[PDB]
Amino acid sequence: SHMATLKVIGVGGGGNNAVNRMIDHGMNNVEFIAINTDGQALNLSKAESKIQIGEKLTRGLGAGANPEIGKKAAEESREQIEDAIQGADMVFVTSGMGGGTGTGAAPVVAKIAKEMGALTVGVVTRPFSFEGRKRQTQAAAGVEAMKAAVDTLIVIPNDRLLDIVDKSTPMMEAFKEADNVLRQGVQGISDLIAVSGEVNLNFADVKTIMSNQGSALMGIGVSSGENRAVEAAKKAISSPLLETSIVGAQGVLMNITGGESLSLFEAQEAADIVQDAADEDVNMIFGTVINPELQDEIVVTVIATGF
Template sequence: MGKVTIKIFGIGDGGNNVIRHMLQHRLHGVEYIAVNTNQLALLQLSQEHKLLIGEKQTKGYGTGADSLLGKRAAIEAKEEICKRMKGADMILLCAGLGGGTGSGALPVFAQLARELHALTIAFVTLPFPFEGKKRMRTAMASMEEIYTYTDTCITLSNRHILQHLGNAPITCAFSTANSIIQQGIQALYELITIPVYINVDYADICTTMEKQKHGFIGVGYGSGNRKGEAAVKEALSASLLEYDIRGLHHAIVHICGNSDLTLEEVQEIVNFIHTEAGNALDIIFGMAINENLKDEVIVTILAAGDDEAGAVIR
């Protein structure tokens, strides 16, 4: 299998935080670029990991939550953006929506990535309810454009972060959201770069994710007598995602266990996913053997679909 080139762009303050988090868990051969209109936000990053856009538009001071200014900043930097994207097979775009740079610039990045024929996947976060209606309107307007140009968009909801982590320190809550994006990207990376017993390759990822709309990704761990069911339940419980697996029609299921894992156990895992999904999932199946897993199994589920498939908001 040829080497797949992956480039990750974190756009705006929220996207920059994802890049900083991911640089602590670097994946071999992956390029990480933090993008901002605010020069100060990029100061502590090395040149290879940052891109300042819209200097003529913003003078390096940011957009003041003006998404139109964020869009103009990205259009101004179009040539440099394309240069940084060149050669990528897969482009992953991360942003928190509701402000100016992430909401305005990400759709432009997505359009350019699509024009370069890269598989384009967005990981975005919606605003907290207390941030007000204006930021949510800005986020939803951006989402409509993002759906137009990305192959799949995986959406985290700050509403769910508030529900599940409302009593946690704010740094912990945001770190958890960044970790979920990082784990999702790592799962994608490992699916297509690590040789396994039954391979899932880049073409399989494209088949599942291309020209869809809503995405889901979850990783679960299980042990004991009902380890498969436990792993699936954990993978499907990705509680901070805006959409769950119900209504999505395309999926990759990757199972990792030791050589004692039986065909019957594998069948039970896949059947349980079908039951929980509540629809006829078109599944691409992969499997890895890891003897370090004693009585454990790891299940990774990647799924996508469009509105016609009936994607379900949690």
């Protein structure tokens, strides 16, 4: 076939939560896998594929906050993990850094995926500041292990969630907003992989921009009316949740989707917004897709790397 296989793997409590919320929202052409030391949380997982790691180590009661326990559980379940991953051309590993299962096992899962040739993308959170300095330091070590294990890594500091809520936004909704990064990135990459464009981008272009690239920005912006293209681009590159800014980006995959009214001029304006915002000359892998069922709506998908 010529259709890449995409899998999303949630490791630990936060990653399993992300998996479950993405499933609830509705995702179609992606295989979800849940990996955990916590048997109860895994029994509540909506993922079609489930891997309880560290069963003898932990008896399904969790790894605690020893990254080494989660790491050992993952390494001891390597074969199960590999069998679950087999067939994947692209693998998204999502996890909450700080704990023992995510922080320790997500890099092992990512390394396993990377050594099977899958384009391996990490989307991990850092703990809130109020969780303390030891938690944040452990999260940092986990983030560096992730960087060493993945093709590219998106970090979402939980503190940024305090910048998008008002005083009454339910925690559930804010966590759904954090998960939207991963979900909308997966959906955009999927659509781009699948849909032929007037300037065509395929999976190999995604690899070009994301293979062995370290830190990354992943964003999407939708807009309508006058100045829609510029505004969608600005939305795409200006997410308050992402640690990495677009500045200093050396590579960028950029796709623009619109109706049949999509003008070359406004696509140029969007690409200029992105190319200038980097404050650098950026290797842009650029694409355009005409979705005739859109009308006055323009969607700008951006993936930046090279920091």
